[PDB]
Structures are given as structure tokens and as C-alpha cells.
Design a binder for this molecule. Sequence first.
Ligand SMILES: NS(=O)(=O)c1ccc(-n2ccn(-c3ccc(F)cc3F)c2=O)cc1
Ligand SMILES: [Zn+2]
Length: 257
Amino acid sequence: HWGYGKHNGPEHWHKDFPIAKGERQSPVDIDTHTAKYDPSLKPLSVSYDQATSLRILNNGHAFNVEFDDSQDKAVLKGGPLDGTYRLIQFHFHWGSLDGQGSEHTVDKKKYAAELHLVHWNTKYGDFGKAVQQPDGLAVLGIFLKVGSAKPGLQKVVDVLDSIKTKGKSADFTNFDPRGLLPESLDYWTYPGSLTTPPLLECVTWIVLKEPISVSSEQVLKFRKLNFNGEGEPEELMVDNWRPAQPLKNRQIKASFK
Ligand SMILES: NS(=O)(=O)c1ccc(-n2ccn(-c3ccc(F)cc3F)c2=O)cc1
Ligand SMILES: [Zn+2]
């Protein structure tokens, strides 16, 4: 099965998932000087006031905080998007060292981690139908750097001991994802893909310019998670990021200049 190891990592994925070599794969390097300001881009509308978190799950590749997406409770609209996209889950990618961990890069700079807030287009009725469509998903990506603690992240950090291994889940209600956002909603956007198998080319990527800062203690707690299940040999869940893929015939657009 695919993973992030020496024998099953990103360079192997194309054997089971040939779209890994496709025309709109993610992540990419964001070259800030070649991105083009698009004044027709609208400000993002992030409406998370009614978000209903349900649970947190270690899926063996990352941990997902999952939300109730059976009604328009937490939605993303505006920006480059047409229609309404519902928040289904968020997760992170992170490194074994503070100098790596993000999937997107900015002028080849790697951040310590990257947050992905995953949303699906309500015109397709459910998430599984949405991932089959070229405009099915919108993922809001936010970079993490190590510095001051992020207070809004601490309740995530504190539950991780309960989902150490693959397949473990825990109740996780009343979490407010607005506490994970930076001050500015300036962004870059491009059409791309899921960054893990099945690597489907269904994502409008929206990557925020402004990182959030988390403390060294917070990221150390991510690095104590395990890829393995309980009772299997322990392998630390670190470096669960795919490297930058070729931009090919794509232009990255900026909402700011
Ligand atoms: N890192 S990311 O681009 O934000 C990303 C990467 C992979 C996923 N992902 C993996 C499996 N699935 C999935 C789950 C249920 C389903 F019906 C279809 C899927 F593709 C999925 O959405 C979701 C998000
Ligand atoms: Zn992700």
C-alpha cells in the first residue's frame, strides 16, 4: 500500500495511480514573481460561525478533524469559486525537522507544516461525487512556521494522545476552525489535485500568503503520532508530505499585488 516510506513513497505512487504524472498535479512551487495578480478575483468568504466538528481520526497518513457536512454550516465561497463549498474535514502535513513539512513551497521555501481545510461543491450532492469533477473540491492551504504558539490549535494538540495509531478515533465536538486562520485572507490560486492517492484532479487550490505560527512544543506533539496501527512496529508519523510537482500548463493567480 502507498505511504511515505522508502519503498512506497511519492516516487512509487504512479505505479498504482498513473494520474500521479498527470497535467494538474499538486502540490506545486509558488514562484511569487511569476504569479499574476488577477483583479477580477473576489475576496474569500469564509463562513465558519456554525461549524459542527464531530470527530478526529488517525487514518494512517495524517489525522482528520471531521465535520457535519449534511447542511450548509461551515462554507467557503467567493475568491475563484463558483457556488458554495462545504467544509468536510481538515488535516495537516508536517516534517521531521522544522525546515520541511509543507507540501506547497513559496519560492522554493518549505514551511514546517501545512494545514488543509477540505471543502466540496454542494452542486454535486456528496463528497464522493465531487471528487470525480474538475471543480469538485476547494482546499484552503495555510502554512505553519515555528515561533509563538497558536492558541486555536492547542485543543487539537491535546487530543492527539488519544489517536496515536492508525484507525483510532475520538469524539471532537465544538471545535472552532476560525482559530486556525491568519489575519489576512490574501491568497494564490491554481487548479490542482489531491496530494495523496487517488491523486484525483478535482481541486481548486487556495493557498494563503500569511502563515500561522505554532510553537515548537505543538509541532513536537504532531511528530509523536504513528503511521502504524496498535501492536504493529512503531513508525513515527513525520514527513507525510508530497514534494512539489511540475506546474505544466498552469498559471498561478494572486489576489494581491
Ligand atoms: N492533502 S489533500 O489534497 O487536501 C487530500 C488528499 C487526499 C484526500 N482523500 C484521500 C482519500 N479521499 C477520499 C475519501 C472518500 C471518498 F469517497 C473519496 C476520496 F477520494 C480523499 O478525499 C483528501 C484531501
Ligand atoms: Zn492535505
